[PDB]
């Protein structure tokens, strides 16, 4: 008896690993850009924590749309990174 999920999220996690590596490689030399994005994640994790602290009834101030728009405004010139990012919230998925 398992029921504990033996098949976790492998492909999207491995894609994420490569993506974060790709983010570094993409803007290697400019810490502010990568750090700013990291702080975005930091901020969303904070908001998510605070939301679930109230059970989830309380909605955070940082929405997925907000995040994505912030990321797009964050990484300019190279949309290829954002193109990779699109897999972490694909419009094709509802």
């Amino acid at each position: 008896s398992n029921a504990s999920l033996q098949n976790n999220q492998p492909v999207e996690f491995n894609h994420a690993i490569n993506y974060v590596n790709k983010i570094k490689n993409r803007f290697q030399g400019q810490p502010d850009i990568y750090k700013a994005f990291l702080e975005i994640l930091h901020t969303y994790q904070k908001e998510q924590r605070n939301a679930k602290e109230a059970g989830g009834n309380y909605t955070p101030a940082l929405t997925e749309q907000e995040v994505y728009a912030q990321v797009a405004r964050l990484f300019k010139n190279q949309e290829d990174l954002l193109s990779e990012f699109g897999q972490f919230l694909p419009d094709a998925n509802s």
Binding site: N8, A16, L38, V67, L89
Partner: protein
């Protein structure tokens, strides 16, 4: 409850992304990792 049917939420897109960021970085999310008080200032390699 309004929905007593409890269901795990493995489908969390941001979770594996931020987790990957947490793994491929020295996880500086101001999150107490382990023995981390003054160990990492600029981070690890």
């Amino acid at each position: 409850s309004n929905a007593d049917y409890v269901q795990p939420q493995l489908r969390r897109p941001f979770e594996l992304l931020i987790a990957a960021a947490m793994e491929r970085n020295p996880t500086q999310f101001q999150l107490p990792n382990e023995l981390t008080c003054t160990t990492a200032l600029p981070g690890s390699s």
